[PDB]
């Protein structure tokens, strides 16, 4: 029963609730960003510099 | 030698019933205008209708054959 | 301070439940939507009418304006 | 006059709300600009460093910039002087000022192309349709000497002679330099020059939408949850009657 | 005082206007615009300051400084986007705020209403000067055309004009004084907004039925704080969507071309939010009469409170007034449309009609239908 | 008299777990709150981002 | 005419306040005359009016209305306040006219 | 960060004009708060004793 | 005024030299800042001496 466990550990004391919002944001950012860029780039395969970059890199 | 996919598709499009009908209208205007000294009329409107239909058609197709 | 001087009220009872005992969005199909329609229905004929009457005016004038750009072949017959 | 022809809507690879710019097409468009338009058209707001990480290498970009002589100064004696270009320099101007520009184009003034696609109704569709739309005037229409017929240009008599024709140059990546291909590439390039943020702007728009959806949702629940106390509330009138 | 929210001279204020403030239990979403307007305002100011910090008020640098801001400043393009589009959002919100008030007879709160009108005028002047700053073709000719109307005021005509321009034509001196005004006015807006809310709080909010809500008031928080925050995100999504996905949707491309005094643009027209007024302006051919018609098109708002004849406050229970109201709204889309169209038939006559109908509906029909409606209730 | 007064039926609105007039509503308390507080905590995280 | 009397009942239904259970008089904007008129209402009429209004406001907040059965019917709408309001206005006009005199 | 560069230069100047144009209004703002707190108690006076008997 | 390193110094000079009463307005502003401080320092002093800080 996560809702129960979460409520007792995370949402009960305002102190832990805020602490939860922080780590929640830290993790969420890292994840939301990667996923977002991954979606964006995949939707634009081979059009970005990132892609065609190999063609001109090699001294 | 290389060919401009535009000219190709331009030709293929001029076939359209839309173009043909428009194209015909023009040749008619051009003819009566060219054969009359001292007048106003200009086959702009007609030219435009043709160009509008031809070019409309070209748009869907043209980019398919461009890198 | 405006709470307490507001109005003279008598014999009215009200009952309510903590939000943690009820449903945030309850009866979506049996109650919600039906009313959404009820409401939509009752207004459409007051609102829509003039907006539509405008769409027309708009559509006419937009075209009537373009029509005046096309030429009248009856100016190049007599020449 | 008073009649105008509107360009069609070409399906650019960067037309989608989430579709970026094809950087290969932008790289080519640069060459077209560098080797053809730049002889008459200035692009004051773009610098060689702007190419880096977008269409060129840092090494490539530095080279491109050294192919140009820039006037610096003053020096000790208060003299101006030439020097090779740096990536911090902007694309070179063809003429010193508009007066000189017109003088070299029959009184015509080729506009700066930095914001051209946003400065003309039609954007790349208009620029593309114009570049590839040169033709002969219909019956009854005479174009004054020095001017050329183009239905897409207002007034139809443009002071620019058809700038591009098949194989007028060649791409070092080996792409068939047909006229329409060229115009297509320079137009893609012109979009970038007018708004380098294009891609980032759409990548953000995406993140904005997801977060917007997620948040509008959650807040709708919360609002409903609080108001539930009132929405379900019942009342009665009980006079001592 | 037990709780430091009632006694503290400052927390008592935040409290007595956003936390314990008695609000009608049934105000709809049309009551969400006041807060949006507020938030919008703080937002415009913040993005404006950020831009002002990279701007240069000089005819030889204005256009380019903005270009420099978009191209070189970290997120400069974004801040620029949000500011110009924010001005739109501001107006969309303000127009609905007004409509709401007209429909639900809020204007009966006269001082709250009259200050609202002043806010509108200030906001319009603000956007007017701000528009000149990027110094593009529409910025210059918009400035030139509109400010030139004042010379149509007999006697002190050319005077006020050449005084306002600081010269013989819209030039640098005009630019620098416009930057100052654009930087200033927003603070006056914030100022007056405070007064607006003060008068409002005397009476408290009106509500959709137009009947005393004293029997059912509720604490602004959490009810309306949550309702208002939601109303924010709802609006914000389209604002941002249009901003980030179609940046140049609303803007005129003629402004991507540096102002030029020797080249009048083919079609000089304002941003969407001024169109309706532009239409009424030209509807009357005669420089002075057109100015007066424009003036009244907005100043008419000061008259609404006096043309209320109904015995009921809102239009919720007045079907005749309702349609007349929606006719008026549609009358405005028409004027808007006409404003964006060149001065040629059929537009010219459609325009004069829409203008004529606009004043007729407000000065004649509305007060009349209200009287008629009272008799249909046997009053 | 007040004795003739009773609280109406809130079945149409009750959450499931507290729908049965004979079951301790305390057992599902931490559940009903953990959910609503989770929604809130999430809105916070989204807003923080 | 007994015609416009058909109009009345039409309008009455078009208005729609009866759907909230409000009486015609319950919808009057509370200007000064109305304010005074209400102060003269008998306790019972006053409390009945109060509940009707608090009831409508609750409906309005809920975005609901009364079941068709409960709607006030045109011929059963009690114009309870009009008699008093009519008087408050008579008195006022008297004073007004007398003070110019 | 404050300079907007490596030395006091144009970017610093333009942001200083903006701040100079801004701060005065904040001063006016806070001045209002100043007088509000003051009015709670009322003015003090040279002898430092309650002036309630003679306002 | 013109907030730019190439025009700031001159824009102020232009204001004093060309603007109707620009010199006077400039004088009052710079000297007003002084008056402002003279006043503020006495304001503070008074407050310290008469214990207004309470
Ligand atoms: C690296 C990333 C990290 C950065 C984030 C750090 C920020 C963390 C700060 C701490 C988090 C705040 C905690 C608040 C605690 C107070 C509290 O009680 O909860 C909030 C409290 C509710 O309390 P209860 O539900 O009753 O729960 C009681 C617990 N038993 O109030 C709330 O509802 C607040 C949360 C709602 C957020 C609303 C904000 C809406 C705003 C809209 C956005 C602009 C254009 C964009 C341009 C595009 C680039
Ligand atoms: C001025 C410039 C004009 C530019 C264009 C502005 C944008 C125009 C878009 C039109 C707005 C579309 C909104 C449709 C709303 C549909 C709707 O719900 O209408 C019916 C609904 C029924 O409510 P009740 O009668 O109280 O019944 C309660 C029972 N549940 O009516 C309402 O919501 C009230 C109307 C308020 C919204 C008014 C918005 C119109 C805005 C236009 C500006 C007008 C003011 C004049 C400005 C002069 C300067
Ligand atoms: C100098 C000989 C030119 C070369 C090489 C190119 N252009 Fe040009 N362009 C030139 C002139 C003299 C003009 C002025 C036209 C007028 O009568 O005003 C132009 C104009 C343009 C325009 C559009 C102008 C408008 O719409 O008002 C564009 C968009 C344009 N030129 C594009 C363009 C491109 C992409 C070129 C390289 C492929 C190019 N021009 C070369 C002269 C010359
Ligand atoms: C700077 C712009 C404005 C701001 C910041 C603003 C703000 C507010 C706020 C926050 C409210 C309370 C909540 C609401 O009802 O929306 C309000 C109410 C009101 N405002 Fe404005 N307003 C602005 C412009 C105007 C304008 C232009 C008018 C009308 C000419 C106006 C008329 C009113 C009225 C009459 C109310 C009463 C609402 C009611 O019926 O309860 N306001 N305004
Ligand atoms: C009521 C709030 C405000 C409104 C309605 C508003 C509106 C506008 C408008 C319409 C423009 C032109 C946008 C464009 O098309 O480019 C503009 C530009 C500008 N505004 Fe504001 N503004 C507001 C507040 C401010 C404030 C407070 C400042 C200064 C601290 C400011 C600084 C600027 C600057 C620097 C520009 C020029 C750069 C640009 O064009 O983006 N604005 N503003
Ligand atoms: C923007 C600058 C300021 C303004 C506009 C201002 C204004 C005022 C005004 C009008 C008064 C009432 C009349 C008087 O006693 O002079 C006052 C009183 C006072 N101000 Fe200021 N003040 C300013 C700055 C300060 C400063 C810097 C201090 C001290 C750090 C201060 C401390 C006080 C105190 C303590 C009083 C109480 C006077 C008393 O009755 O003994 N003020 N101020
Ligand atoms: C500096 O000029 C700025 C314009 C603008 O659109 O501002 C956002 C603009 C551009 C082109 C043509 C006209 C305008 C300004 O128009 C107006 N600007 C107005 C500004 C304030 C007030 C009270 C009324 C105004 N009316 C008008 C009207 F549209 F009616 F002409
Ligand atoms: C979308 O790409 C962005 O381009 C920016 C370049 O201005 C980088 O600073 C960002 O980190 C990157 O995500
Ligand atoms: C309604 C509130 C929406 C907020 C959306 C936040 C998304 C902005 O995210 C931005 O995306 C850019 C492109 O990847 C990055 O370069 C920036 O660093 C990042 O902050
Ligand atoms: O304006 C409002 O006026 C009210 C009346 O004084 C105050 O209580 C509020 O704090 C203030 O914001």
Domains with residue ranges and CATH for chain F: 1-49 (1.20.5.270)
- CB of D221 less than 8 A from some CB of C: yes
- Please report, for chain D, the start and end positions of each structural domain, with discontinuous segments joined by +: 1-196, 197-241
User: Which CATH architecture describes the domain D197-241?
Assistant: Up-down Bundle (1.20)
- CB of E67 less than 8 A from some CB of D: yes
- Helix intervals (H) in D162-235: 179-194, 198-231
CB distance E20 to D225 below 8 Å: no
* D53 in contact with ligand 8, CB cutoff 6 A: no
A45: closest CA of chain F, how far (Å)? 28
Cis peptide before E346, with omega less than 30 degrees from 0? yes
Q: Alpha-carbon distance G59 to G20, whole Å?
A: 7
- Please report, for chain C, the start and end positions of each structural domain, with discontinuous segments joined by +: 1-79
Q: How many CB atoms lie within 10 A of CB H44?
A: 17
Q: Which of residues 9-38 of D touch E (CB under 8 A)?
A: 17
Give Cα separations from G16 to B24, E279, G10, G23 (angstroms). 64, 38, 10, 10
CB distance E127 to E271 below 8 Å: yes
Q: Alpha-carbon distance E131 to D139, whole Å?
A: 45
Give the closest residue (by CA) to ligand 9 atom 15.
Answer: D204
Determine the atom of ligand 9 nearest the C-alpha atom of D207. Answer: 7
CB distance D4 to D52 below 8 Å: no
- CB of E248 less than 8 A from some CB of C: no
- Token pair in block for residue G9: 């009942």
CB distance E199 to E112 below 8 Å: yes
Taking chain D, what is the end-to-end CA distance rounded to the nearest angstrom? 86
Homologous superfamily of domain range C1-79 = Cytochrome b-c1 complex subunit 8 (1.20.5.210)
Burial of A58 (0-12, 13-18, 19+ CB in 10 A): exposed
Smallest Cα–Cα separation from C60: which of G41, E299, E347, D81?
E347
Cis peptide before H33, with omega less than 30 degrees from 0? no
- Token pair in block for residue I48: 């310290």
Q: Are B42 and D138 in contact (CB < 8 Å)? A: yes
Homologous superfamily of domain range A1-59 = Cytochrome b-c1 complex subunit 9 (1.20.5.260)
Q: Alpha-carbon distance E328 to E306, whole Å?
A: 18
Cα dihedral across residues D181, D185, D191, D194: positive or negative: negative
Q: Alpha-carbon distance E61 to D160, whole Å?
A: 29
> Between E272-283 and E287-299, two packed helices, what is the crossing angle to 10 degrees?
130
Cα dihedral across residues B21, B24, B25, B26: positive or negative: positive
For the annotated catalytic residues of E, the residue numbers are 201, 205, 227-228, 271
Contacts of F15 in chain C (CB under 8 A): 20-23
How far is ligand 6, taken at its centre, from the CA of residue I43, in Å?
Answer: 6
Residues near B42 by beta carbon (within 8 Å), at least 6 away in sequence: B33, D138, D139, D140, D141
- For H18, the 3-state DSSP assignment is helix
- Helix intervals (H) in chain F: 29-48
CB distance E211 to I36 below 8 Å: no
Q: Alpha-carbon distance B57 to B14, whole Å?
A: 9
Contacts of I3 in chain E (CB under 8 A): 55-57
C46: closest CA of chain E, how far (Å)? 5
- Token pair in block for residue D145: 């000497």
Residue with tokens 């694309």: D91
> Which string of DSSP letters, residue by residue, matches A28-57?
HHHHHHHHHHHHHHHHTTTTSHHHHGGGG-
CATH of B1-67 given 3.50.50.60, 1.10.287.20, 3.30.565.10, 1.10.4010.10 = 1.10.287.20
Q: Considering only the beta carbons, identify the residue of D17, D204, D215 that sits closest to E233.
A: D215
Q: How many CB atoms lie within 10 A of CB E82?
A: 22
CB distance E282 to E347 below 8 Å: no
Q: Are D219 and E237 in contact (CB < 8 Å)? A: no
Its domain, for residue E6, covers 1-379
Strand partners, D147: none
Which residue ranges of H are tagged as binding site for a ubiquinone?
Answer: 39
If you measure CA to CA, which chain H residue comes closest to E73?
H4
Strand partners, D52: D56
CATH code 3.40.50.12280 for D1-196: no
Contacts of F25 in chain C (CB under 8 A): 21
- CB of D222 less than 8 A from some CB of F: yes
Q: Alpha-carbon distance D12 to D20, whole Å?
A: 10
How far is ligand 10, taken at its centre, from the CA of residue D146, in Å?
Answer: 72
Rounded to 5 degrees, what angle do the CA atoms D134, D139, D141 make?
70
Q: Alpha-carbon distance D215 to D211, whole Å?
A: 6
The values of phi and psi at residue D219, to 5°, are: -65, -25
- Token pair in block for residue G65: 């209305």
| CATH (domain of G63) | 1.10.1090.10
Q: Alpha-carbon distance D195 to D123, whole Å?
A: 12
* Beta strand spans in chain H (E): none
> Which string of DSSP letters, residue by residue, matches E54-102?
T---STTTHHHHHHHHHHHSTTHHHHHHHHHHHHHHHHHHHHHHHHHHH
Q: Alpha-carbon distance D231 to A18, whole Å?
A: 30
Residues near E137 by beta carbon (within 8 Å), at least 6 away in sequence: E254, E255, E257, E258, E259, E260, E263, E265
Burial of E231 (0-12, 13-18, 19+ CB in 10 A): buried
Q: Are D236 and C13 in contact (CB < 8 Å)? A: yes
Burial of E275 (0-12, 13-18, 19+ CB in 10 A): buried
Q: Tell which of D24, D51, D185, D188 to mutate to test the A interface (max A CBs under 10 Å).
A: D24
Residues enclosing ligand 3, CB less than 6 A? D 32, 36-37, 39-41, 105, 108, 110-111, 116, 120, 127, 131, 158-160, 163-164, 186
Contacts of A57 in chain D (CB under 8 A): 57
Q: Are F13 and D211 in contact (CB < 8 Å)? A: no
Its domain, for residue G32, covers 1-101
Method by which the coordinates were obtained: X-ray
Smallest Cα–Cα separation from I1: which of D98, E22, H14?
H14
* E27 in contact with ligand 4, CB cutoff 6 A: no
Q: Resolution reached, in Å?
A: 2.7
**H or E stretch including E301?**
none
Burial of A54 (0-12, 13-18, 19+ CB in 10 A): exposed
* Beta strand spans in chain D (E): 69-72, 81-84, 148-149, 157-158, 234-237
Other chains touching E, judged by 3 or more CB pairs under 8 Å:
C, D, G, H, I
Give Cα separations from D137 to B40, B46, D155 (angstroms). 15, 12, 11
How far is ligand 4, taken at its centre, from the CA of residue E97, in Å?
Answer: 6
How far is ligand 3, taken at its centre, from the CA of residue E261, in Å?
Answer: 22
- Helix intervals (H) in D165-197: 179-194
Strand partners, E217: E24
Strand partners, D148: D158
Please report, to the nearest 10 degrees, the dihedral formed by the alpha carbons of residues E255, E260, E264, E268 taken in order.
30
Residues near E32 by beta carbon (within 8 Å), at least 6 away in sequence: E227, E228, E231
Q: E218: left (phi > 0), else alpha (psi -120 to 50), else beta?
A: beta
Starting from the CA of residue H43, give the closest ligand: 6
- Token pair in block for residue D221: 């629940």
The DSSP secondary-structure symbol of D111 reads P
Give the closest residue (by CA) to ligand 7 atom 24.
Answer: E124
Q: Are E216 and G57 in contact (CB < 8 Å)? A: yes
Give Cα separations from G27 to E312, E325, E367, G52, H40 (angstroms). 6, 20, 19, 11, 44
Determine the atom of ligand 5 nearest the C-alpha atom of H18. Answer: 30
Q: Does I29 carry a binding-site annotation? A: yes
CB distance E94 to E41 below 8 Å: no
Give Cα separations from E62 to D106, E58, E353, H9 (angstroms). 30, 5, 40, 18
Strand partners, C15: D234
Residues near E218 by beta carbon (within 8 Å), at least 6 away in sequence: D230, E22, E23, E24, E25
- For E22, the 3-state DSSP assignment is strand
- Token pair in block for residue E70: 């978009």
Instruction: For chains H and D, tell me whether 3 or more CB atom pairs sit within 8 A of each other.
Output: no
Smallest Cα–Cα separation from D110: which of D73, D150, D161, D152?
D161
- Please report, for chain B, the start and end positions of each structural domain, with discontinuous segments joined by +: 1-67
Q: Are H17 and I5 in contact (CB < 8 Å)? A: no
Q: Are D222 and F40 in contact (CB < 8 Å)? A: yes
Rounded to 5 degrees, what angle do the CA atoms B26, B31, B32 make?
105
Of D208, D211, D213, best ligand 1 pocket probe by most atoms within 8 Å of the beta carbon: D208
CA neighbours within 13 Å on the CB side: how many for D8? 20
Give Cα separations from E195 to C45, D228, E221, E341 (angstroms). 39, 34, 22, 39
CA neighbours within 13 Å on the CB side: how many for D240? 2
Give the closest residue (by CA) to ligand 1 atom 5.
Answer: F48
């Amino acid at each position: 029963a996560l809702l129960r466990q979460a409520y007792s550990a995370l949402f009960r004391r305002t102190s832990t609730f805020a602490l939860t919002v922080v780590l929640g944001a830290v993790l969420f950012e890292r994840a939301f960003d990667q996923g977002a860029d991954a979606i964006f780039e995949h939707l634009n395969e081979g059009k970005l510099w990132k892609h065609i970059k190999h063609k001109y890199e090699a001294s | 030698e290389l060919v401009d996919p535009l000219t190709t598709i331009r030709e293929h499009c001029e076939q359209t019933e839309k173009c043909v009908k428009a194209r015909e209208r023009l040749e008619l205007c051009d003819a009566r205008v060219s054969s009359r000294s001292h007048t106003e009329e200009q086959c702009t409107e007609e030219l435009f209708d043709f160009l509008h239909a031809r070019d409309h058609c070209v748009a869907h197709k043209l980019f398919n054959k461009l890198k | 301070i405006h709470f307490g001087n507001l109005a003279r009220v008598r014999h009215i009872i009200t009952y309510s439940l903590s939000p943690f005992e009820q449903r945030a969005i309850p009866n979506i199909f049996s109650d919600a939507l039906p009313n959404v329609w009820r409401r939509f229905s009752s207004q459409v004929f007051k609102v829509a009418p003039p907006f539509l009457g405008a769409y027309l005016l708009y559509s006419w004038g937009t075209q009537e304006f373009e029509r005046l750009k096309r030429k009248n072949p009856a100016d190049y017959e007599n020449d | 006059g008073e009649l105008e022809l509107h360009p069609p809507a070409f399906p650019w690879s960067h037309g989608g709300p989430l579709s970026a710019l094809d950087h290969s097409s932008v790289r080519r468009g640069f060459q077209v600009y560098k080797q053809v338009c730049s002889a008459c058209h200035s692009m004051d707001y773009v610098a060689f460093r702007n190419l880096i990480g977008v269409t060129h290498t840092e090494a490539e970009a530095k080279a491109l910039a050294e192919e140009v002589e820039v006037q610096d100064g003053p020096d000790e004696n208060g003299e101006l002087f030439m020097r090779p270009g740096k990536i911090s320099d902007y694309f070179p101007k063809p003429y010193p000022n508009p007066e000189a520009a017109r003088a070299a184009n029959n009184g015509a003034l080729p506009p700066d192309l930095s914001y051209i696609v946003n400065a003309r109704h039609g954007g790349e569709d208009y620029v593309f349709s114009l570049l590839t739309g040169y033709c002969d005037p219909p019956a009854g229409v005479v174009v004054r000497e020095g001017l050329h017929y183009n239905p897409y240009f207002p007034g139809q008599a443009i002071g620019m002679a058809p700038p591009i024709y098949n194989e007028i140059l060649e791409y070092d990546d080996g792409t068939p330099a047909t006229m329409s291909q060229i115009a297509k590439d320079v137009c893609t390039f012109l979009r970038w020059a007018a708004e380098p943020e294009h891609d980032q702007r759409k990548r953000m728009g995406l993140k904005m939408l997801l977060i917007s959806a997620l948040l509008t949702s959650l807040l709708y629940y919360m609002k409903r949850h609080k108001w539930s106390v009132l929405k379900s509330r019942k009342m009665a009138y009980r006079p001592p009657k | 005082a037990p709780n430091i929210r009632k006694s503290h001279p400052l927390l008592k204020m935040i409290n007595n206007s956003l936390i314990d403030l008695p609000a009608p239990s049934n105000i709809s979403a049309w009551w969400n615009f006041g807060s949006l307007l507020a938030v919008c305002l703080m937002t415009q100011i913040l993005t404006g300051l950020l831009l002002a910090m990279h701007y240069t008020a000089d005819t030889s640098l204005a256009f380019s400084s903005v270009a420099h801001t978009c191209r070189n400043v970290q997120y400069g393009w974004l801040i620029r986007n949000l500011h110009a589009n924010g001005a739109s959002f501001f107006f969309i919100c303000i127009f609905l705020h007004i409509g709401r008030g007209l429909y639900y007879g809020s204007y009966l709160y006269k001082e709250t209403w009259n200050t609202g009108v002043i806010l509108l005028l200030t906001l319009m002047a603000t956007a007017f000067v701000g528009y000149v700053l990027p110094w593009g073709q529409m910025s210059f000719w918009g400035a030139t055309v509109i400010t030139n109307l004042f010379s149509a005021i007999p006697y002190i005509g050319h005077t006020l004009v050449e005084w306002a321009w600081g010269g013989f034509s819209v030039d640098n001196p005009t630019l620098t004084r416009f930057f100052a005004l654009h930087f200033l006015l927003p603070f006056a807006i914030a100022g007056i907004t405070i007064i607006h809310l003060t008068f409002l709080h005397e009476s408290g909010s009106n509500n959709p039925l137009g009947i005393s809500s004293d029997s059912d008031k509720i604490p602004f928080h959490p009810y309306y704080s949550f309702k208002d925050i939601l109303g924010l995100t709802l609006m914000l999504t389209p604002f941002l969507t249009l901003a980030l996905f179609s940046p140049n949707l609303l803007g005129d491309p003629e402004n991507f071309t540096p102002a030029n005094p020797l080249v009048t643009p083919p079609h000089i027209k304002p941003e969407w939010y001024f169109l309706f007024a532009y239409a009424i302006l030209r509807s009357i051919p005669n420089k002075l009469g057109g100015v007066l018609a424009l003036a009244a098109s907005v100043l008419i708002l000061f008259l609404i409170p006096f043309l209320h004849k109904s015995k009921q406050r809102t239009m919720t229970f007045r079907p005749l007034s309702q349609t007349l109201f929606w006719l008026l709204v549609a009358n405005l889309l028409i004027l808007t449309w006409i404003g964006s169209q060149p001065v040629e038939h059929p537009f010219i006559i459609i325009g004069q009609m829409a203008s004529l109908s606009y004043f007729t509906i407000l000065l004649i029909l509305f007060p009349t239908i209200g009287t008629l409606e009272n008799k249909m209730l046997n009053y | 008299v007040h004795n003739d007064v009773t609280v109406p039926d809130f079945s149409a609105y009750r959450r499931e777990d507290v729908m049965d007039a004979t079951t301790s509503s305390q057992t599902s308390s931490e559940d009903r709150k953990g959910f609503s507080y989770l929604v809130t905590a999430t809105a916070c995280v989204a807003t923080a981002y | 005419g007994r015609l416009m009397d058909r109009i009345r009942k039409w309008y009455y239904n078009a208005a729609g306040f009866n759907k909230y259970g409000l009486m015609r008089d319950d919808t009057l904007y509370e200007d000064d005359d109305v304010k005074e008129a209400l102060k003269r209402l008998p306790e019972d009429l006053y409390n009945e009016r109060m509940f009707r209004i608090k009831r409508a406001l609750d409906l309005s907040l809920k975005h609901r209305i009364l079941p068709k059965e409960q709607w006030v019917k045109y011929e059963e709408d009690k114009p309870y306040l009009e008699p008093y309001l009519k008087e408050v206005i008579r008195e006022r006009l008297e004073r007004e006219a007398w003070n110019k005199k």
